[PDB]
């Protein structure tokens with residue numbers, strides 16, 4: 001038993017809701033919240049900009065130190081950093097950004113990072129400003145992630161569509 005509430009069950013291990021991941025995070029304090037990161041951990045907009053804003057820019061300060069030490073992530077890769085006031089940990093996962101021309105097949109590799117964590121609150125990778133089809137991101141998620149994933153979908157109209165087209 002865990003503390004997520006109002007999610008619809010899509011599969012044995014994937015759940016979905018219409019929620020603001022920032023607000024869901026501040027209420028659940030999940031062990032892991034997933035950031036929709038880029039390779040530079042520059043959290044300017046989308047989910048990343050919102051999560052970072054909710055941390056009063058502490059996420060960005062920590063991220064800049066990480067990059068200065070380690071260099072950029074790989075597309076499809078991830079790193080674990082602090083969750084600040086939102087979670088114990090933030091898993092920064094880089095899905096491919098279609099608006100940069102990155103290979104959508106890397107989306108499966110991105111979701112594989114979720115399997116290193118028993119339970120996660122996450123957005124749909126490569127959705128939103130990353131330019132991928134969220135219905136596809138959902139199919140890859142379901143077919144790749146084996147751990148328990150609680151997906152927060154900000155847009156109500158999209159949430160209803162994700163639901164009604166799901167197989």
Ligand SMILES: O=C(O)C[C@@H](NC(=O)c1ncnc2[nH]ccc12)c1ccc(Br)cc1
Nearest residue numbers: 021036046050126127128129130153154155
């Ligand atoms: O859910 C959606 O509409 C898709 C969109 N999501 C979010 O912008 C999101 N999601 C959850 N909480 C949030 N608070 C604020 C934004 C937000 C998205 C955009 C870019 C990438 Br890359 C991946 C996903």
